[PDB]
Design a protein around this ligand. Sequence first.
Ligand SMILES: Nc1ncnc2c1ncn2[C@@H]1O[C@H](CF)[C@@H](O)[C@H]1O
Ligand SMILES: Nc1ncnc2c1ncn2[C@@H]1O[C@H](CF)[C@@H](O)[C@H]1O
Ligand SMILES: Nc1ncnc2c1ncn2[C@@H]1O[C@H](CF)[C@@H](O)[C@H]1O
Ligand SMILES: Nc1ncnc2c1ncn2[C@@H]1O[C@H](CF)[C@@H](O)[C@H]1O
Ligand SMILES: Nc1ncnc2c1ncn2[C@@H]1O[C@H](CF)[C@@H](O)[C@H]1O
Ligand SMILES: Nc1ncnc2c1ncn2[C@@H]1O[C@H](CF)[C@@H](O)[C@H]1O
Ligand code: MET
Ligand code: MET
Ligand code: MET
Ligand code: MET
Ligand code: MET
Ligand code: MET
Lengths: 291, 291, 291, 291, 291, 291
Amino acid sequence: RPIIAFMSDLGTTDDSVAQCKGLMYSICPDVTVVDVCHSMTPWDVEEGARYIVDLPRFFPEGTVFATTTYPATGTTTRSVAVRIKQAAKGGARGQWAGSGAGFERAEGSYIYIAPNNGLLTTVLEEHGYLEAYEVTSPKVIPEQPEPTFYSREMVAIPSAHLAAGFPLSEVGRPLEDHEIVRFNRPAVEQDGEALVGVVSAIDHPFGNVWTNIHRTDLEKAGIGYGARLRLTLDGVLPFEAPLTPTFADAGEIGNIAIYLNSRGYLSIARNAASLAYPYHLKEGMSARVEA
Amino acid sequence: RPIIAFMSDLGTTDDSVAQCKGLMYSICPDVTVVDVCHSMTPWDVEEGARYIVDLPRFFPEGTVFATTTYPATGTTTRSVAVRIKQAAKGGARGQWAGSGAGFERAEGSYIYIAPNNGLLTTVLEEHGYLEAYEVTSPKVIPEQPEPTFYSREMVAIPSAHLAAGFPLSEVGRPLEDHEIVRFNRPAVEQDGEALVGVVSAIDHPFGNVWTNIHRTDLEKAGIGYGARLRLTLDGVLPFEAPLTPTFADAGEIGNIAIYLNSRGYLSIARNAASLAYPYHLKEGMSARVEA
Amino acid sequence: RPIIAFMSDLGTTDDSVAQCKGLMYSICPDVTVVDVCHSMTPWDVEEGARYIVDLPRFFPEGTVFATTTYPATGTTTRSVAVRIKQAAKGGARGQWAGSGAGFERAEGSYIYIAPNNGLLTTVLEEHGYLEAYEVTSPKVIPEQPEPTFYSREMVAIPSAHLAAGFPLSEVGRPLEDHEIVRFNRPAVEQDGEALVGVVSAIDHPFGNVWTNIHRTDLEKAGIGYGARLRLTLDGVLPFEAPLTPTFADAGEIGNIAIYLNSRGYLSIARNAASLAYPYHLKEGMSARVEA
Amino acid sequence: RPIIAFMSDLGTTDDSVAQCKGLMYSICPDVTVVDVCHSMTPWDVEEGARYIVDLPRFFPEGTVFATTTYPATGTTTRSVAVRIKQAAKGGARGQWAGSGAGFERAEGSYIYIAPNNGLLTTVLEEHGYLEAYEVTSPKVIPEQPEPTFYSREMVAIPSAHLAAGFPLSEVGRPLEDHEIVRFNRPAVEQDGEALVGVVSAIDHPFGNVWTNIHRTDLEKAGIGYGARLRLTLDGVLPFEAPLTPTFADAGEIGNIAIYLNSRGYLSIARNAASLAYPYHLKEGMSARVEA
Amino acid sequence: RPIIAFMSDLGTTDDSVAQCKGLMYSICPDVTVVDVCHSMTPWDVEEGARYIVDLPRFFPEGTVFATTTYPATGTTTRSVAVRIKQAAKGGARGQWAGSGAGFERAEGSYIYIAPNNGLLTTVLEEHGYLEAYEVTSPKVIPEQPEPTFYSREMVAIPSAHLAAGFPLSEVGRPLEDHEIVRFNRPAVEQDGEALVGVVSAIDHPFGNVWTNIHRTDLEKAGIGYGARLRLTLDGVLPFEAPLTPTFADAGEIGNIAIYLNSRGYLSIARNAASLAYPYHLKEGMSARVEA
Amino acid sequence: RPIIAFMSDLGTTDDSVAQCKGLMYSICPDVTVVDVCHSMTPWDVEEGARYIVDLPRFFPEGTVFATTTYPATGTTTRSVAVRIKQAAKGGARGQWAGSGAGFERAEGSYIYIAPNNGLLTTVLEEHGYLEAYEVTSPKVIPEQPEPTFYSREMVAIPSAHLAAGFPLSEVGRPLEDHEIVRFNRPAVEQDGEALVGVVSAIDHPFGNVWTNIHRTDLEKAGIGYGARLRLTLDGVLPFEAPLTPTFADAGEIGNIAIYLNSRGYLSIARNAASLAYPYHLKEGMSARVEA
Ligand SMILES: Nc1ncnc2c1ncn2[C@@H]1O[C@H](CF)[C@@H](O)[C@H]1O
Ligand SMILES: Nc1ncnc2c1ncn2[C@@H]1O[C@H](CF)[C@@H](O)[C@H]1O
Ligand SMILES: Nc1ncnc2c1ncn2[C@@H]1O[C@H](CF)[C@@H](O)[C@H]1O
Ligand SMILES: Nc1ncnc2c1ncn2[C@@H]1O[C@H](CF)[C@@H](O)[C@H]1O
Ligand SMILES: Nc1ncnc2c1ncn2[C@@H]1O[C@H](CF)[C@@H](O)[C@H]1O
Ligand SMILES: Nc1ncnc2c1ncn2[C@@H]1O[C@H](CF)[C@@H](O)[C@H]1O
Ligand code: MET
Ligand code: MET
Ligand code: MET
Ligand code: MET
Ligand code: MET
Ligand code: MET
């Protein structure tokens, strides 16, 4: 009973996703196709990455992630399929997802198939990989790919073949590490004991504000759950609050909460109100934090 | 073949819904997960309720409704799980749903699991219940729950255990009626022959206008299909038309129709044009009807 | 393993689609309901037709297409249900969908059920039909249908009975060809040797621009892939470029590609950048093209 | 434009072949069905094999060979489908087929589907194979197969699915080499300088006589075009003539020609008269050659 | 992509069939012409009927059957074209042909054109008809028909016009039921619980023996698949065997098998050997069966 | 939509024809190969000529006729390829083939390719020719042709190149009229006012008897349709009857018709009964006829 979890930039306004879904049931009739999300900003591979990197621990082993934004559609470029290593713990503590102590997940248990455009950068950085292959076999892609729709032709279609049991090694030749494209993610800067980063994203639809300053960064400045923090956004907004587990820890509705979000990252928001929407806060603004 | 129908405020712009889905297929491999909607205004429990209250009669017996907006996420509060009594007839006429005479649903046949923040107020009012429990058992919720994601930890996850056959009485201790939180429903006031109420919702994406004046409120004042009616929104804009069953009864395209919506409530629209969107009509505006 | 592909104008903001789905599982427990889209402009039948005409070749044989915008809901109008003939090749080339040489589809393999309001016009043109029937039988629609929800009562419910094996000829009497409503499809004219049409659509979320000028109109206007073309939109904005297979053929990010889309029609875009949103381009604007 | 070349023992005296053809055009509407022959002696798998073993190099890449005599029809046996390796050169000289230097055929380019009764023995010997599967999947064969017509149910029908693009590995589980049934080919014996063999076939409708002594058997004993040869059929009738490439080399009409047939095998005939038919020569009779 | 399936008595020894085929591509250039068979005993309309009555379920809807033996060639007789009603299930069980549960076929979906000499007798008896017409219009037949070749002039030619879309109703005036010629088929006699019929045919090239005692006759004597039967042929040959699905159920090669043939009729044969050819069994000999 | 009409002496008992066809689709993928016949007496060039002379008026313009018996296969002989002139009326009357007034065929519209052994004699007499060429070019025949299969190497392969548009004049040098081999066609003599010829053919499968005495020989012997005729065959068997248009003109089943066949020549038959097989009549027997 195999699952393909499908993340694209195709939107949900026309029949493009359905076209892929139809081909997924044509090829693997007993497949369950779980939508991740299709709303991402087109061609923004750093954002697409955000929506896929935390997925594996939540799915049954054998799940295939089909993840694509494909600006080089119609070119000699060919996709990449990789088996990941660690399923990886996650969240604010670092733990397995699920009831009890959680579903512990085996190694080598999930496959990603994506354009070779850097979309899987963080996936590989945070999980590792056991093997990678270029996707060129006409048993899993079309002989005549539709030039402008490689997200269906070089991702959806082969993802269903893999989901139906088609051997990963037979999709094409192995790829060396340097042949897999990456983007570089900027580091969290240091010193003064302060940490300098950015707003990775606005957490829709709440308007929470997410930074790229991970828990591991907070640790190794000695920052923990009682610490009176000062987090400055956009160079001019020095918010001040203790680091708390959650939103209601700020007291009244509307108050400020500095917390670790559900993916392990330092964040700021308001208790049952929007921080970012009234003040038009945006991804890309700076983010410093300190004692 | 179990189903879980899933209503949240999580949105469809990132992978949050998909994390919960991955866990629901993990716990209950045969499940079908049906999306209700994930767009509701965050923290707005009266809005959440309109999306879930009419559902039971449409779904197969056995269906579980995971319904969640969780502003108290990370606190010591705990979710509630209830087996509802009557599936209840609905619509502008009062009937079972489906082809023929409709599909009649046995009592005690559906379970809702939600935050105990009042979300189920209208569900309980309209359907009753046979049993209620606080959801505390580490067999159906995580030992270490993610503080900012209780909609996944305390609704999505145990909704999957219930779909799988985990006995309802084993999720936690019984809740007494007064321990279940409720919102107060603003009453429809009498004021001469005029019934005063409120625009409960704009009916997206058409721009139809729904009030909280029920058909039982109408057939209390002797108003039935065919009476001429004045209807005053925001105190200032009145509207005259007969009460008809549907939009095409208004004559030309654009003409005003006053009707009973598919949930039994008095409503007003234009025939195949939007009424709300040109005039920026909004929920919360008053609504006065009179014959 | 039956499939229903569901296209409506119901939106995804409330529980309307899910009520339809609940009754689809009720009637055909083993069904898979695939969403096409639900975001279309209400009552815009030409737009609905673009989202459903190209689907068949992507879906397993036996698939039912529930496709509906129902402005006449509550009237004595009754739906139409057809078995189409040729599943029809598509795309820029004119091929079957799938890996390798694509998957061919036996004729008479798909049913569309829809309102008799012309929504199926282009499906019938592009595919032909073997049978067509009024949907009146109480075995497959309600005896007392909800006046304002015919997309559920005369499309969603019937489609499920058909997915479950219910005989197509038993839904009601046959219709003759003249009783199937069509919208007339405005032709691409010639003003000299320049071709004159409309922007059929803004291809969200990318902001590409699609025209109603087909590949067949370019052939025997004497226009193939080398040709240098002047495209003018709204009778104001001119753009120049050769006709290419795809976006990256235009060179640098931001440059103009004029190309043929995955449905066969002349289109225009920027390479990995939006063209429609900065210049606020829209559906319905004239589109002229010369060599 | 897919082709299926169809070899059976069904005859051409009733509609049996046409039932299979009707189903092949049904499943794969673009197919061209090319008859091989339908006259073979029923149940004679060695005869069937000579008609199908030399075919691949003549046909376009992609061609599917439905080849069937099914004495085990109605039993639990199941057909085999194999992608052959080399198209292989052939003829009296060894070459690709066609105009010019001939049409060279890529490896892995043809599929045979047959009963697993040994029919493909010489195909596998002469062409090899890359993959083999048992044909069990109810997507390519009937749920309730007609007991006395497996050549239609388990060859003709799935041959059409394969022509249509149904993935070869999805027809059933992999077969290991020893699970593929084989007939034992009687060897050409050495006996001094004399090579002993057998008349493999009468070459209808000319009455030429074919042996199972190959050219590699000849050019093993140093015999080439021009040597004087004695050839003894049925132990008693000898024949003296030089080995020439063709019939006209024998001189007058009626004279004896010993030659290499178009399949590389040593043969004997008369120049523009029948040799077999006057003397009632027959397959199975011995054949001894010597220089 | 229309199909004409062509059954004649013209043989395959000269160019007569080709002459018809040439005219079929002249008139409907995109036609596929499928040979049924051309070997039938000239003027034997009962045999010709046997080769056409089971065809419809095997072909795509819209197929035209052109079926002719024409002893009244050169007379004032004119052919008949009929649309049939039921495509009809068939075989030993009674089922649709094809993979899975089979291709279900619409009503009114096939046309037969034949001399009005009784050739279509069983076609009409087993399928029914919706309309019949005499073939007299000079748009579909010659003004000057070749006196001795009405199988080309009054069948092949008009069959291609119909295949090209020419309206059936416009070939000539409607025919009343009594104006369509029939031959009478002898009933299967009854009583003693024994059933008395004949050998309908010898199943070439195997030498199986077919009777006119259908499955429906066997049913309603209570005869099924375990029954120890006694079938006497030619008044003197009381064969004795159980009724089995197929040939291999008799055990050793050469043993007797009483089975239901692939058209639903009681038959007798040997397991991988000829019953009829060694003993010169013939169509027309008697056939009784019993406990 | 090119057509090759294929007449050979290859028979239908092995894969010889199909090897030819495989290479025909290889060379001209969009071709339709129509079989004329393959059952002719090997090497009997007069008989081959009767099966091909009357074909052109039945076939779409542009059709290629691959017609071959090749007793000189393997020699330095090279095929001939001609474009004929008049497509020529035919039949008993002298008309165009087809519905209505028949279809006229432009001159220079058909090519025959055949061995230069006289097979084309009557085609050239009856049709004339505009060009004639030796087939020697390596673009259209093999460089190393199979010695015993020139019907495939110098007829089948070349015919496909010609069907695909290959220029006729480029196959090799032109031939002058004397270099095209003819068989001399034995004349119908007069012994007084009685006419003396041969049975040209037994018209299988009916057993009618065809003579080499044409309609033109009957005209100005003073013999039209009323005339009472004494036909004598083999110089022994006498038959008497008037000349009639067709078979049923003879009255009762079994009676003698003397008539004119669909190719224009005096013939004799029984009405709906065989004449040749009971009396074992044969090709080559004398045929005398007087009034
Ligand atoms: N305008 C565009 N420029 C470059 N790439 C584009 C554009 N519009 C859409 N795409 C990509 O096409 C792929 C189809 F598979 C989608 O994933 C888009 O990223
Ligand atoms: N900013 C927020 N304040 C209070 N609650 C919030 C906030 N953002 C999201 N939530 C709730 O967290 C739950 C996690 F499951 C979601 O359902 C939101 O209702
Ligand atoms: N205001 C409206 N006028 C006419 N039709 C409407 C209006 N609002 C919604 N609808 C249609 O009701 C159908 C219910 F099934 C939906 O498909 C809408 O198209
Ligand atoms: N009499 C027969 N015994 C065993 N097999 C048979 C017999 N007659 C026909 N067959 C086989 O049935 C298959 C049906 F598809 C044909 O291919 C025959 O080989
Ligand atoms: N000898 C014949 N008597 C009566 N009919 C005949 C005879 N020979 C052939 N035919 C019929 O001619 C038709 C030509 F269309 C064929 O279908 C034969 O049935
Ligand atoms: N025995 C034969 N002598 C001369 N020609 C022959 C003989 N047997 C077959 N053929 C011819 O070979 C050609 C191969 F293309 C066929 O057309 C036969 O006529
Ligand atoms: C904070 S509410 C939970 C959903 C949120 N988008 C998250 O990923 O954590
Ligand atoms: C008004 S058209 C049907 C959809 C609408 N949202 C309803 O619930 O009734
Ligand atoms: C242009 S990217 C592919 C999606 C687009 N909507 C299409 O169907 O062609
Ligand atoms: C001998 S003439 C060519 C036809 C023959 N059957 C062959 O295969 O070679
Ligand atoms: C018994 S083998 C299958 C062919 C046979 N002539 C039939 O019609 O069933
Ligand atoms: C005599 S019935 C028609 C077929 C016959 N062979 C002919 O061509 O005339």
